[PDB]
From Swiss-Prot, chain B:
Span of domain MPN: 32-161
Function: Functions as a scaffold that mediates the ordered assembly of spliceosomal proteins and snRNAs. Required for association of BRR2 with the spliceosomal U5 snRNP, and the subsequent assembly of the U4/U6-U5 tri-snRNP complex. Functions as a scaffold that positions spliceosomal U2, U5 and U6 snRNAs at splice sites on pre-mRNA substrates, so that splicing can occur. Interacts with both the 5' and the 3' splice site, as well as the branch region. Has a role in branch site-3' splice site selection. Associates with the branch site-3' splice 3'-exon region. Also has a role in cell cycle.
Additional remarks: Present with 468 molecules/cell in log phase SD medium.
Full protein stretch here: 2151 to 2395 of 2413
Location of this chain's protein in the cell: Nucleus
Top-level taxon of the source organism: Eukaryota
Gene name of the record: PRP8
Protein's UniProt name: Pre-mRNA-splicing factor 8
Summary of subunit composition and partner proteins: Component of the U4/U6-U5 tri-snRNP complex composed of the U4, U6 and U5 snRNAs and at least PRP3, PRP4, PRP6, PRP8, PRP18, PRP31, PRP38, SNU13, SNU23, SNU66, SNU114, SPP381, SMB1, SMD1, SMD2, SMD3, SMX2, SMX3, LSM2, LSM3, LSM4, LSM5, LSM6, LSM7, LSM8, BRR2 and DIB1.
Record comment regarding domains: The MPN (JAB/Mov34) domain has structural similarity with deubiquitinating enzymes, but lacks the residues that would bind the catalytic metal ion. Contains a region with structural similarity to reverse transcriptase, presenting the classical thumb, fingers and palm architecture, but lacks enzyme activity, since the essential metal-binding residues are not conserved.
Swiss-Prot record, chain D:
Other known facts: Present with 1440 molecules/cell in log phase SD medium.
Stretch of the intact protein here: 1083 to 1217 of 2163
Quaternary structure and partners: Component of the U4/U6-U5 tri-snRNP complex composed of the U4, U6 and U5 snRNAs and at least PRP3, PRP4, PRP6, PRP8, PRP18, PRP31, PRP38, SNU13, SNU23, SNU66, SNU114, SPP381, SMB1, SMD1, SMD2, SMD3, SMX2, SMX3, LSM2, LSM3, LSM4, LSM5, LSM6, LSM7, LSM8, BRR2 and DIB1. Interaction with PRP8 is important for recruitment to the U4/U6-U5 tri-snRNP complex.
Cell compartments where the protein resides: Nucleus
Domain notes: Contains two helicase domains. The N-terminal helicase domain has catalytic activity by itself, contrary to the C-terminal helicase domain that may have a regulatory role and enhance the activity of the first helicase domain.
Phenotype when changing R25A: Reduced ATP-dependent RNA helicase activity
Protein name: Pre-mRNA-splicing helicase BRR2
Protein's organism: Saccharomyces cerevisiae (strain ATCC 204508 / S288c) (Baker's yeast)
Family label: Belongs to the helicase family. SKI2 subfamily.
Signal peptide (residue range): none
Biological function: RNA helicase that plays an essential role in pre-mRNA splicing as component of the U5 snRNP and U4/U6-U5 tri-snRNP complexes. Involved in spliceosome assembly, activation and disassembly. Mediates changes in the dynamic network of RNA-RNA interactions in the spliceosome. Catalyzes the ATP-dependent unwinding of U4/U6 RNA duplices, an essential step in the assembly of a catalytically active spliceosome.
Length: 39, 245, 624, 135
């Protein structure tokens, strides 16, 4: 093990990760605009 | 092999000389179901010696005692029967027919070749499949029919029996998956000459789809009418025979 | 030999012992399910039995028998026409894609592909030119088969006089019967020999290595005469590494070792049927092609690895996966019944009994439960099965999301409205033998004015294994392909291949020289002439775009707007990252066009776009 | 004979002709007995057997086979179909009959025949006159 140191499930996790990454910018921009509105 | 059963069916009226009804000691505190004797007689006369034949029963309460459920109509429906089991089309839309006003669906009536003191697995399965989500108080009237005699027994089903028929969505012939006789309880049935019931039948008259599996739709949305029911091997159940010859 | 012995042959089969019971059971039932065993000889016999029983004449009109394979339909039609002693087409005949051999419209017995029959149900749903239908080899459960099971279950109401026969295997005869109204099964014995079966007492670590180990043991623990071996394996690259490994073991310590796979050129496929000497042993290393498509004599031994390369469509990702998966119990038994053909035999299973009991499902999953269905749903809307489609009686219903995704695809293409109802564009597309994108692109190519090129490109896109890439010669195979290279795409490189093929007078020797499969090319031309016939049936003009190949690429956007990607590649709508398949003209330690459209997405060793075309984004919102 | 089978042996193929050229009277006498005795089920059956002897066809056959001028192809198609005769009757338009046959040309003629096929509309009501007598 020291020297040596599902596929579709991992791809569905990569799909979820890429969606989550791209949606975060819109969430942050919504917070930034919310802060301007609150100000 | 139908040819032998067709011959045998001609004599079913002789079986009605021995009518036994399953009776326990009476209980005024629970329902009693009253079957008109003419309905029973005709139902046996149209049935088959081997194959299970089935129908719905519709009825209502008398004024004298609310718990006395008179059966008024037998609704015979598109079905495909077997020994020991029967495949029944859905609970019929009959409401646009005359005189259906104030009828309950009371449940189902059917023939069997085995004699029992409880509901069998195919009964509990088909009874659950028909009534579980719709009207759980509906009875089964089972009829043992055998040479010389018919024996009638009525049952309520427990929620344990309903649940078991939900767990057993289909039955392979002897799965016996913790089936219990105690899933069913005796129901008070009386057979009466004092009253006469009638038949509703499908509008194309034919109800036995044994020779006609392709036109049986078990989901099917069939139209119905009052009318005299055809026997199991009537010509109209058997059109191919008359096309071959 | 000769036209006398032919009848004794027919009488000597076990189907003849019960011939009168067969032709009576079909009189007393409109539907029959038949378990015919391998040595029943069912396929040639019963068709003759029913014609001779009289239905096939102008009394009833013709008999049809479906096959799943083209070559099967022709071969059994030749056999039965010769058993009936008639020139093929005149009373016995056949009708398959590109090839109708029926010299009269009233040709009395007609063998067909299940797809051909399915095509005919659209033009005549009652099929009134036929008295009897036989579904042969229906245990294979093809898409066309599975559709016809529902279609016939409804149509035989609409025709009491239409007789129906369904062949079945033992895993599913009850299941088939119950669907068809619990109508009677009939079981015929066959003249088949016993096969001894041996599970492995443990899971094997690597089935390739156990396979060669057991091959040498069967070969040399016995003396080398009088008993040949079949070994089942998952794919060409796996198979080719195995021959290499097994030859060396003999040279350390006679044996003849032969490949078979569908991508193998036909001359080398054919030689496996030719004989082997006494004292020498034949051994055959095979894909699933040797389960059913091919039949070998003198095999007495089988080794089964227990895994196969099954395609499954993932509808969520929209992605085919070719997965090395455990086989079904049925499939294991079919492999086992390859021994036992010629004489008593043995099957060695590289897996345990419990893995066969639980880890292997009983039946194989039907194709309809695991493929994209949009060709099917298009056709099943084109014949006016409506929300009747949305509730359609299949034996084994496709997954809800598969249906809804195919509906979404058709709605996207504009074959379907927001309620879910067929558009006239849909009905036109359904008259092509095509997945709907390839009909969309041909109809669009009319208006765009590239029908002429589009015909041959769509033809080439239909065809498997167009280029040949043997084990050591990856460089030479690609070098020959690259003489036809178009810098834009694989798609226009297919055009250059077909043009150069033709300029060489369609030469087979040119095909071989340039490492292209001639079988694939001749099928492409047959498809081109068929699609040209369909266009001339729809009266469409076959306009050429000339050197303005961008017109084709604009048309591709009309059909393939979902099947698009962008460089890291990254899918247009789901956003998953994906790769160009290494065969692509656009692949290498090299080329990188920014925006991409593609013919298929497929997971193999990697999540690959199968073949690649470059695009401008403006066309994607132009067409959709 | 009700099925119109074909026969080779002259003796048997004249036994059958003797049977059918007597059958009508005999069935009509059987029918009369049941109708007089009041037995509904056999009376209805025997009326169909009398009609079958008259028409050389069974109740499962369609009455286009009873219209002597009809084309055979139409009869055979409809006998295959699940649609009841009492359903095909309900058409009032010539084009609709053409569709129902899958023949435009024959729709024109067969519509005429359909409008000739004997048909009844019936209504009934009862009135109690006395306790015992119903009109």
């Amino acid at each position: 093990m020291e020297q040596n140191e599902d596929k579709m499930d991992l791809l569905e996790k990569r799909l979820a990760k890429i969606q989550q990454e791209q949606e975060d910018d819109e969430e942050l921009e919504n917070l930034r605009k919310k802060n301007l509105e609150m100000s | 092999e139908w040819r032998k059963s067709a011959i045998a069916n001609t004599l079913l009226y002789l079986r009605l000389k021995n009518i036994y009804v399953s009776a326990d000691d009476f209980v005024e505190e629970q329902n009693v179901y009253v079957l008109p004797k003419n309905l029973l007689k005709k139902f046996i006369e149209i049935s088959d010696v081997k194959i299970q034949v089935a129908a719905f029963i519709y009825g209502m309460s008398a004024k004298d005692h609310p718990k006395v459920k008179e059966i008024k109509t037998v609704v015979l429906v598109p079905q495909l029967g077997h020994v020991g089991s029967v495949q029944i089309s859905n609970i019929p839309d009959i409401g646009d027919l005359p005189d259906t006003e104030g009828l309950e669906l009371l449940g189902w009536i059917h023939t069997q070749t085995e004699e029992l003191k409880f509901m069998a697995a195919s009964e509990v399965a088909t009874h659950s499949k028909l009534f579980a989500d719709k009207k759980r108080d509906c009875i089964d009237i089972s009829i043992f029919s055998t040479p010389g005699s018919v024996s009638l027994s009525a049952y309520n089903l427990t929620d344990e029996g309903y649940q078991w028929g939900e767990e057993n969505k289909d039955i392979m012939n002897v799965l016996s998956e913790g089936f219990e006789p105690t899933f069913s309880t005796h129901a008070q049935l009386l057979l009466s000459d004092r009253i006469t019931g009638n038949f509703i039948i499908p509008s194309g008259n034919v109800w036995n789809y044994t020779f006609m599996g392709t036109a049986f739709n078990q989901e099917g949305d069939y139209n119905f009418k009052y009318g005299i029911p055809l026997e199991f091997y009537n010509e109209m159940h058997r059109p191919v025979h008359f096309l071959q010859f | 030999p000769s036209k006398d012995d032919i009848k004794h042959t027919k009488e000597q089969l076990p189907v003849f012992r019960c011939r009168s019971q067969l032709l009576s059971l079909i009189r007393e039932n409109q539907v029959v399910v038949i378990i015919g065993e391998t040595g029943s000889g069912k396929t040639t016999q019963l068709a003759q039995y029913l014609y001779e029983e009289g239905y096939a004449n102008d009394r009833g009109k013709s008999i049809v028998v479906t096959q799943p394979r083209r070559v099967a339909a022709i071969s059994v039609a030749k056999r039965v026409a010769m058993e009936m002693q008639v020139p093929l087409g005149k009373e016995v005949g056949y009708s398959i894609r590109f090839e109708d051999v029926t010299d009269s419209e009233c040709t009395k017995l007609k063998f067909v592909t299940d797809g051909i029959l399915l095509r005919e149900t659209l033009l005549d749903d009652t099929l009134d030119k036929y008295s009897c239908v036989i579904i042969d080899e229906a245990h294979e459960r093809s898409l066309n088969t599975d559709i016809l099971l529902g279609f016939f279950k409804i149509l035989l109401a609409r025709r009491r006089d239409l007789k129906l026969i369904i062949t079945s295997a033992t895993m599913n005869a009850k299941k088939f019967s119950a669907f068809f109204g619990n109508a009677p099964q009939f079981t015929i014995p066959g003249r088949t020999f016993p096969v001894q079966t041996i599970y492995t007492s443990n899971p094997v670590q690597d089935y390739v290595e156990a396979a060669v180990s057991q091959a040498v043991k069967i070969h040399l623990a016995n003396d080398c005469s009088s008993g040949d071996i079949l070994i089942f394996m998952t794919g060409q690259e796996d198979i080719e590494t195995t021959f290499d490994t097994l030859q060396e073991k003999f040279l350390q310590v006679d044996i003849e070792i032969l490949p078979i796979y569908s991508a193998l050129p036909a001359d080398l496929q054919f030689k496996i049927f030719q004989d082997l000497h006494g004292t020498k042993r034949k051994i055959i290393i095979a894909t699933n092609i040797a389960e059913t498509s091919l039949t070998i004599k003198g095999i007495r031994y089988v080794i089964d690895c227990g895994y196969s390369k099954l395609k499954v469509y993932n509808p969520k990702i929209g992605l085919d996966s070719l997965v090395i998966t455990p086989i079904s119990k049925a499939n294991a038994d079919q492999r086992s019944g390859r021994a036992g053909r010629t004489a008593p035999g043995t099957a060695y299973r590289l897996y345990t009994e419990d893995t066969f009991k639980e880890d292997m499902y009983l039946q194989t999953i039907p194709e309809i439960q695991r493929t994209n269905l949009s060709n099917t749903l298009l056709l099943l809307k084109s014949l006016d099965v409506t929300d009747e489609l949305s509730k359609f009686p299949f034996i084994d219903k496709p997954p809800l999301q598969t249906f809804l995704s195919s509906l979404y695809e058709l709605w996207f293409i504009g074959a379907i409205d927001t309620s879910g109802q067929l558009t006239p564009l849909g009905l036109q597309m359904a008259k092509f033998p095509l997945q709907p994108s390839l009909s969309k692109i041909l109809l669009i190519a009319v208006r765009n004015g590239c029908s002429d090129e589009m015909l041959t490109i769509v033809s080439m896109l239909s065809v498997p294994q167009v280029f040949y890439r043997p084990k050591e010669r990856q460089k030479e195979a690609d070098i020959a392909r690259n003489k036809f290279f178009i810098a834009k795409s694989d798609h226009l490189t297919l055009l250059n291949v077909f043009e150069q093929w033709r300029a060489n007078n369609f030469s087979s020797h040119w095909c071989n020289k340039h490492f292209v499969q001639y079988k694939s090319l001749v099928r492409a031309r047959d498809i081109r002439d068929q699609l040209l016939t369909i266009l001339k049936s729809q009266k469409i003009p076959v306009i050429s775009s000339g050197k303005d190949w961008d017109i084709i690429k604009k048309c591709i956007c009309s059909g393939f707007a979902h099947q698009a990607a962008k460089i890291t590649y990254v899918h247009l709508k789901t956003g998953v990252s994906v790769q160009l398949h290494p065969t692509s003209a656009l692949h290498g330690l090299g080329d990188l066009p920014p925006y991409v459209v593609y013919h298929e997405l497929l997971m193999t060793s990697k999540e690959y776009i199968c073949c690649v075309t470059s695009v401008d984004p403006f066309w994607l919102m132009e067409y959709g | 004979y009700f099925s119109q089978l074909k026969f080779e042996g002259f003796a048997l193929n004249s036994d059958i002709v003797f049977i059918h050229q007597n059958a009508g009277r005999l069935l009509r006498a059987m029918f009369e007995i049941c109708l007089k005795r009041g037995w509904g089920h056999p009376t209805r059956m025997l009326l169909n057997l009398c009609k079958s002897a008259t028409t050389k066809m069974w109740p499962t056959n369609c009455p286009l086979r009873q219209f002597k001028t009809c084309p055979v192809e139409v009869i055979k198609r409809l006998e295959a179909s699940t649609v009841p005769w009492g359903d095909y009757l309900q058409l009032e338009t010539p084009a609709e009959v053409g569709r129902a046959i899958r023949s435009e040309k024959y729709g024109k003629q067969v519509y005429d025949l359909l409008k000739r096929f004997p048909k009844m509309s019936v209504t009934c009501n009862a009135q109690p006159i006395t306790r015992s007598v119903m009109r």
